[PDB]
Write an enzyme that holds these catalytic residues in place. Sequence first.
Site, PDB file in Angstrom:
ATOM      1  N   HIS A   7       0.865  -1.205   0.000  1.00 42.79           N
ATOM      2  CA  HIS A   7       0.000   0.000   0.000  1.00 42.79           C
ATOM      3  C   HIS A   7       0.893   1.244   0.000  1.00 42.79           C
ATOM      4  CE1 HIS A   7      -3.026   2.761   2.114  1.00 42.79           C
ATOM      5  NE2 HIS A   7      -3.637   2.408   0.964  1.00 42.79           N
ATOM      6  N   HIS A  49      -0.993  10.539  -3.003  1.00 39.80           N
ATOM      7  CA  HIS A  49      -2.353  10.109  -2.578  1.00 39.80           C
ATOM      8  C   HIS A  49      -3.322  11.304  -2.576  1.00 39.80           C
ATOM      9  CE1 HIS A  49      -5.662   9.366   0.176  1.00 39.80           C
ATOM     10  NE2 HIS A  49      -5.686   8.179  -0.433  1.00 39.80           N
TER      11      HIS A  49
END
Length: 234
Positions: A7, A49
């Site tokens: 991740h 992100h």
Amino acid sequence: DFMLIGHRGATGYTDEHTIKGYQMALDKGADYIELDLQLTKDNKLLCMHDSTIDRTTTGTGKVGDMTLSYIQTNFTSLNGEPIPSLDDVLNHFGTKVKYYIETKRPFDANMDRELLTQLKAKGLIGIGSERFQVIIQSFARESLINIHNQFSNIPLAYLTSTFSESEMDDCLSYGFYAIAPKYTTITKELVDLAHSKGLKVHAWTVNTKEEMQSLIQMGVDGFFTNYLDEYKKI
């Protein structure tokens, strides 16, 4: 048999979305490195992100308000590492690693076009490519349908914060490979139903060995983790 996904790279051990972190994820046993993307002012894809650089870099502002050159010349990740572009990552790792790439919600036709252009130029999708080299995920059904129209062999993962037959039936209708639900929604009953419909289940974001053990018992096909070392302790 099992898909272990780094991740944003190796977020539990180093800054997210850096080439050093992507390499650390591979070193710690990740099958896939997960990329989040934002478009710069000059329409280039940055590994990032948030819509803004404030949380993870020495700079401030929306990625869309700055050129790629302005960001890469003026700012770094908080740990001093460079902020990589998608092009930086694909040029560095090439066909040696597998990529799990998120497209924007709501659907952004410009992001999807720039992403497929860069992937096709590296031969990571289209003719000559391995099916599972690249998986694309989105919360936006419209983004995944858009990609499926253009490159029908790319496996697509439907991100969801709810896990019911409605989402599974949409996976079947639109030819999605996996449902990717928030791990707190997952039961053995829902995984077994998804499997009965020919869907894979990829849980996010699973950070403790106890959570990992529970989801493997429920039969999940993979998970996104910040703590790749915890998977070896099961």
